[PDB]
Amino acid sequence: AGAALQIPFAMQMAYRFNGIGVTQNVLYENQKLIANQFNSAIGKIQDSL
Amino acid sequence: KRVDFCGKGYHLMSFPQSAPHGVVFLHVTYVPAQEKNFTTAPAICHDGKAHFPREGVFVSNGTHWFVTQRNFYEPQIITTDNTFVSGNCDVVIGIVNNTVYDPLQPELD
Ligand SMILES: *[C@@H]1O[C@H](CO)[C@@H](O[C@@H]2O[C@H](CO)[C@@H](O)[C@H](O)[C@H]2NC(C)=O)[C@H](O)[C@H]1NC(C)=O
Ligand SMILES: *[C@@H]1O[C@H](CO)[C@@H](O[C@@H]2O[C@H](CO)[C@@H](O)[C@H](O)[C@H]2NC(C)=O)[C@H](O)[C@H]1NC(C)=O
Ligand SMILES: *[C@@H]1O[C@H](CO)[C@@H](O[C@@H]2O[C@H](CO)[C@@H](O)[C@H](O)[C@H]2NC(C)=O)[C@H](O)[C@H]1NC(C)=O
């Protein structure tokens, strides 16, 4: 929309969860699990491609 | 609500106008400016209870902690009205200790 504004990534994902109905507590209590799942998925897409 | 469909930024409303063999749209858009940048925190835990913001974000100018909305800046003091509690501050990364004011005790005396 306008000029880019810095924002830490954890809060951006918190906002993105809050967008789809799930409250933002879920992200802040399950950060490590979500990070591991995302890393595994992005690792497997490489081999699949 | 879909971004960059009509306008550039946040859309408010549009007006149509005729043309020789076409149509003309006059979109009205809202664009922020005059930025500032502050120090933030994910959640504040007081007395072992980790309060989170209902809707908005915590900010601090350096010595005080306030809660403000996302797309505009106005400070409101922190009370148990605009924050909700969940769990304890032992697993969340970035918790900063502070004090949270409440209205019930001052209004009960
Ligand atoms: C946000 O705060 C920074 C302070 O770090 C202001 O200036 C930035 O300084 C760093 C360090 O030299 C530069 O790498 C950035 O490019 C600077 N930001 C710019 C030029 O936008 C910055 O001015 C502040 N943002 C404001 C005032 O809008
Ligand atoms: C951060 O903002 C707060 C809120 O205003 C400031 O705290 C008070 O600010 C008023 C002016 O609005 C002063 O009259 C008071 O003396 C301030 N109180 C204290 C205890 O400082 C605070 O000064 C601001 N901090 C910075 C670094 O700008
Ligand atoms: C916020 O302040 C509280 C109150 O002191 C801290 O709680 C204790 O802090 C002392 C000194 O740092 C530690 O020795 C204790 O182990 C702390 N107790 C508990 C139950 O945590 C708290 O650590 C402070 N928070 C941060 C992030 O520094």
CSV table of C-alpha atoms and ligand atoms in Angstrom, one decimal:
chain,number,residue,atom,x,y,z
A,1,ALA,CA,0.0,0.0,0.0
A,2,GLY,CA,2.6,2.6,1.0
A,3,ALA,CA,6.1,2.6,2.4
A,4,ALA,CA,7.4,-0.7,3.8
A,5,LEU,CA,7.4,-0.9,7.6
A,6,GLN,CA,9.6,-3.4,9.6
A,7,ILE,CA,7.8,-6.0,11.7
A,8,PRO,CA,9.2,-9.1,13.5
A,9,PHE,CA,8.2,-12.3,11.9
A,10,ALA,CA,6.6,-13.9,14.9
A,11,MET,CA,4.0,-11.2,15.2
A,12,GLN,CA,3.3,-11.3,11.5
A,13,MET,CA,2.5,-15.0,11.8
A,14,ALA,CA,0.4,-14.2,14.9
A,15,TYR,CA,-1.6,-11.7,12.8
A,16,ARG,CA,-2.0,-14.2,10.0
A,17,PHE,CA,-3.4,-16.8,12.4
A,18,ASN,CA,-5.7,-14.2,14.0
A,19,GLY,CA,-7.0,-13.5,10.5
A,20,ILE,CA,-8.4,-17.0,10.0
A,21,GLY,CA,-10.3,-17.3,13.3
A,22,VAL,CA,-7.7,-19.1,15.5
A,23,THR,CA,-6.6,-16.9,18.4
A,24,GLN,CA,-3.1,-15.7,18.6
A,25,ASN,CA,-2.2,-17.7,21.7
A,26,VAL,CA,-1.8,-20.8,19.6
A,27,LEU,CA,1.3,-19.4,17.8
A,28,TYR,CA,3.0,-18.1,21.0
A,29,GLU,CA,2.6,-21.5,22.7
A,30,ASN,CA,3.6,-23.7,19.8
A,31,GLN,CA,6.5,-21.8,18.1
A,32,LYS,CA,9.0,-24.7,18.0
A,33,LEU,CA,6.6,-27.2,16.7
A,34,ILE,CA,5.4,-24.9,13.9
A,35,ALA,CA,9.0,-24.1,12.9
A,36,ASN,CA,10.0,-27.7,12.8
A,37,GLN,CA,6.9,-28.6,10.7
A,38,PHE,CA,7.6,-25.8,8.2
A,39,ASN,CA,11.3,-26.8,7.9
A,40,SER,CA,10.4,-30.4,7.3
A,41,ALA,CA,7.8,-29.5,4.6
A,42,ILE,CA,10.1,-27.1,2.8
A,43,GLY,CA,12.8,-29.8,2.9
A,44,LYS,CA,10.5,-32.5,1.4
A,45,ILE,CA,9.2,-30.2,-1.4
A,46,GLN,CA,12.8,-29.9,-2.6
A,47,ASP,CA,13.2,-33.7,-3.0
A,48,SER,CA,9.7,-34.1,-4.4
A,49,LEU,CA,10.5,-31.5,-7.1
B,1,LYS,CA,-11.6,-6.4,0.8
B,2,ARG,CA,-9.4,-8.0,-1.8
B,3,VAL,CA,-6.3,-5.9,-2.1
B,4,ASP,CA,-5.2,-4.0,-5.3
B,5,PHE,CA,-8.4,-4.9,-7.2
B,6,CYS,CA,-9.7,-1.3,-7.4
B,7,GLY,CA,-7.4,1.4,-6.2
B,8,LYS,CA,-3.9,1.3,-4.7
B,9,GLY,CA,-4.0,0.6,-1.0
B,10,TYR,CA,-7.1,0.6,1.2
B,11,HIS,CA,-10.3,1.2,-0.8
B,12,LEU,CA,-13.3,3.3,0.4
B,13,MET,CA,-15.7,3.9,-2.5
B,14,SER,CA,-15.8,4.7,-6.2
B,15,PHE,CA,-17.8,6.7,-8.7
B,16,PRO,CA,-18.7,5.7,-12.2
B,17,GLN,CA,-18.7,8.1,-15.2
B,18,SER,CA,-19.6,7.6,-18.8
B,19,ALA,CA,-17.4,7.7,-21.9
B,20,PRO,CA,-17.7,7.5,-25.7
B,21,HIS,CA,-17.5,3.7,-25.8
B,22,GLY,CA,-16.4,2.8,-22.3
B,23,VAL,CA,-16.6,3.6,-18.6
B,24,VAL,CA,-14.4,5.5,-16.1
B,25,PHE,CA,-14.0,4.8,-12.4
B,26,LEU,CA,-12.8,7.3,-9.8
B,27,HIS,CA,-11.6,5.2,-6.8
B,28,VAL,CA,-10.9,6.8,-3.4
B,29,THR,CA,-8.1,5.3,-1.4
B,30,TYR,CA,-6.7,5.8,2.1
B,31,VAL,CA,-2.9,5.8,2.5
B,32,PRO,CA,-0.9,6.1,5.7
B,33,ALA,CA,2.2,8.2,6.2
B,34,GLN,CA,4.4,10.0,8.8
B,35,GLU,CA,5.8,6.8,10.2
B,36,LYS,CA,7.6,6.3,13.5
B,37,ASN,CA,9.3,3.2,15.0
B,38,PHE,CA,9.3,2.0,18.6
B,39,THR,CA,10.3,-1.0,20.7
B,40,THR,CA,7.7,-3.8,21.0
B,41,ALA,CA,7.0,-7.0,22.9
B,42,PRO,CA,4.8,-10.1,22.3
B,43,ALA,CA,3.0,-10.3,25.6
B,44,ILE,CA,3.3,-9.0,29.2
B,45,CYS,CA,3.3,-11.3,32.2
B,46,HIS,CA,2.4,-9.9,35.6
B,47,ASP,CA,2.1,-11.9,38.9
B,48,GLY,CA,2.9,-15.1,36.9
B,49,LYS,CA,0.0,-14.6,34.5
B,50,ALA,CA,0.8,-13.8,30.9
B,51,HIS,CA,-1.6,-11.2,29.5
B,52,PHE,CA,-2.0,-10.9,25.7
B,53,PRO,CA,-3.7,-8.1,23.8
B,54,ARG,CA,-7.3,-8.5,22.6
B,55,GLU,CA,-6.9,-6.6,19.3
B,56,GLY,CA,-3.9,-4.4,18.7
B,57,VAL,CA,-0.2,-4.4,19.7
B,58,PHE,CA,2.0,-3.4,22.6
B,59,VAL,CA,4.4,-0.6,22.1
B,60,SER,CA,6.8,1.5,24.3
B,61,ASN,CA,8.4,4.8,23.8
B,62,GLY,CA,11.2,3.8,26.2
B,63,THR,CA,9.8,4.2,29.7
B,64,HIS,CA,6.1,3.3,29.5
B,65,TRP,CA,4.1,0.5,27.9
B,66,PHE,CA,0.9,1.2,25.9
B,67,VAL,CA,-1.5,-0.7,23.6
B,68,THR,CA,-2.3,0.7,20.2
B,69,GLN,CA,-4.1,-0.4,17.1
B,70,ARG,CA,-2.2,-1.4,14.0
B,71,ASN,CA,-3.0,1.1,11.3
B,72,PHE,CA,-3.0,4.3,13.5
B,73,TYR,CA,-1.2,5.5,16.6
B,74,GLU,CA,-3.0,6.5,19.8
B,75,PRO,CA,-1.9,5.4,23.3
B,76,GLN,CA,-4.2,3.8,25.9
B,77,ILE,CA,-3.0,2.7,29.3
B,78,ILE,CA,-3.0,-1.1,29.9
B,79,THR,CA,-5.9,-2.5,32.0
B,80,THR,CA,-7.6,-5.8,32.4
B,81,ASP,CA,-10.3,-4.7,29.9
B,82,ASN,CA,-8.4,-4.8,26.6
B,83,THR,CA,-6.1,-7.7,27.5
B,84,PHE,CA,-6.8,-11.4,28.2
B,85,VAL,CA,-4.9,-13.9,30.2
B,86,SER,CA,-3.8,-17.4,29.1
B,87,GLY,CA,-1.2,-19.6,30.8
B,88,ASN,CA,2.0,-18.5,32.5
B,89,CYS,CA,5.2,-16.8,31.2
B,90,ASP,CA,7.5,-19.8,31.0
B,91,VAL,CA,7.4,-20.9,27.4
B,92,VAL,CA,6.7,-17.7,25.3
B,93,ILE,CA,9.8,-16.2,23.8
B,94,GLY,CA,10.2,-12.4,24.4
B,95,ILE,CA,8.0,-11.9,27.5
B,96,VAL,CA,8.8,-8.7,29.3
B,97,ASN,CA,7.9,-8.2,32.9
B,98,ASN,CA,5.8,-5.2,33.9
B,99,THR,CA,2.8,-4.1,36.0
B,100,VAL,CA,-0.9,-4.1,34.8
B,101,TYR,CA,-3.4,-1.6,36.3
B,102,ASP,CA,-6.9,-2.7,37.2
B,103,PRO,CA,-10.0,-0.6,37.9
B,104,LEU,CA,-11.7,-2.8,40.5
B,105,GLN,CA,-9.4,-2.2,43.4
B,106,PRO,CA,-9.3,1.6,43.1
B,107,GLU,CA,-13.1,1.7,42.6
B,108,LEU,CA,-13.8,-0.7,45.5
B,109,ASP,CA,-12.0,1.2,48.3
C,1,LIG,C1,13.6,3.6,12.3
C,1,LIG,O1,14.7,3.6,13.1
C,1,LIG,C2,16.0,3.7,12.4
C,1,LIG,C3,17.1,3.6,13.5
C,1,LIG,O2,17.9,2.4,13.3
C,1,LIG,C4,16.1,5.0,11.6
C,1,LIG,O3,17.2,5.0,10.7
C,1,LIG,C5,17.6,3.7,10.2
C,1,LIG,O4,19.0,3.6,10.5
C,1,LIG,C6,19.6,2.4,10.0
C,1,LIG,C7,21.1,2.3,10.6
C,1,LIG,O5,21.9,3.2,9.8
C,1,LIG,C8,19.6,2.3,8.5
C,1,LIG,O6,20.1,1.1,8.1
C,1,LIG,C9,18.1,2.4,8.1
C,1,LIG,O7,18.1,2.5,6.6
C,1,LIG,C10,17.5,3.7,8.6
C,1,LIG,N1,16.1,3.8,8.2
C,1,LIG,C11,15.6,4.6,7.3
C,1,LIG,C12,16.7,5.4,6.5
C,1,LIG,O8,14.4,4.6,7.0
C,1,LIG,C13,14.8,5.2,10.8
C,1,LIG,O9,14.8,6.5,10.2
C,1,LIG,C14,13.5,4.9,11.6
C,1,LIG,N2,12.4,5.0,10.7
C,1,LIG,C15,11.6,6.1,10.6
C,1,LIG,C16,12.0,7.3,11.5
C,1,LIG,O10,10.6,6.2,9.9
C,2,LIG,C1,6.7,8.1,27.0
C,2,LIG,O1,5.3,8.5,27.1
C,2,LIG,C2,4.9,8.7,28.5
C,2,LIG,C3,3.4,9.1,28.4
C,2,LIG,O2,3.2,10.4,28.1
C,2,LIG,C4,5.7,9.8,29.2
C,2,LIG,O3,5.4,9.7,30.6
C,2,LIG,C5,4.8,11.0,31.0
C,2,LIG,O4,4.6,11.9,29.9
C,2,LIG,C6,4.1,13.2,30.3
C,2,LIG,C7,3.8,14.0,29.0
C,2,LIG,O5,2.7,13.5,28.3
C,2,LIG,C8,5.0,13.9,31.3
C,2,LIG,O6,4.3,15.1,31.7
C,2,LIG,C9,5.2,13.0,32.5
C,2,LIG,O7,6.2,13.6,33.3
C,2,LIG,C10,5.8,11.6,32.0
C,2,LIG,N1,5.9,10.7,33.2
C,2,LIG,C11,7.1,10.1,33.4
C,2,LIG,C12,7.1,9.2,34.6
C,2,LIG,O8,8.1,10.2,32.7
C,2,LIG,C13,7.2,9.5,29.1
C,2,LIG,O9,8.0,10.6,29.6
C,2,LIG,C14,7.6,9.2,27.6
C,2,LIG,N2,9.0,8.8,27.5
C,2,LIG,C15,9.8,9.3,26.5
C,2,LIG,C16,11.2,8.8,26.6
C,2,LIG,O10,9.4,10.0,25.7
C,3,LIG,C1,10.7,-9.7,35.8
C,3,LIG,O1,10.8,-9.4,37.2
C,3,LIG,C2,10.6,-10.6,38.0
C,3,LIG,C3,10.6,-10.0,39.4
C,3,LIG,O2,11.9,-10.0,39.9
C,3,LIG,C4,11.6,-11.7,37.7
C,3,LIG,O3,11.3,-12.8,38.6
C,3,LIG,C5,12.4,-13.2,39.3
C,3,LIG,O4,13.6,-12.4,39.0
C,3,LIG,C6,14.8,-12.7,39.7
C,3,LIG,C7,15.8,-11.8,39.3
C,3,LIG,O5,15.9,-11.6,37.9
C,3,LIG,C8,15.1,-14.2,39.5
C,3,LIG,O6,16.2,-14.5,40.3
C,3,LIG,C9,14.0,-15.1,39.8
C,3,LIG,O7,14.3,-16.4,39.5
C,3,LIG,C10,12.7,-14.7,39.1
C,3,LIG,N1,11.6,-15.5,39.4
C,3,LIG,C11,10.8,-16.0,38.5
C,3,LIG,C12,9.6,-16.9,39.1
C,3,LIG,O8,10.9,-15.9,37.3
C,3,LIG,C13,11.5,-12.1,36.3
C,3,LIG,O9,12.6,-13.0,36.0
C,3,LIG,C14,11.7,-10.8,35.4
C,3,LIG,N2,11.6,-11.2,34.0
C,3,LIG,C15,12.6,-11.1,33.1
C,3,LIG,C16,12.4,-11.5,31.7
C,3,LIG,O10,13.8,-10.8,33.5
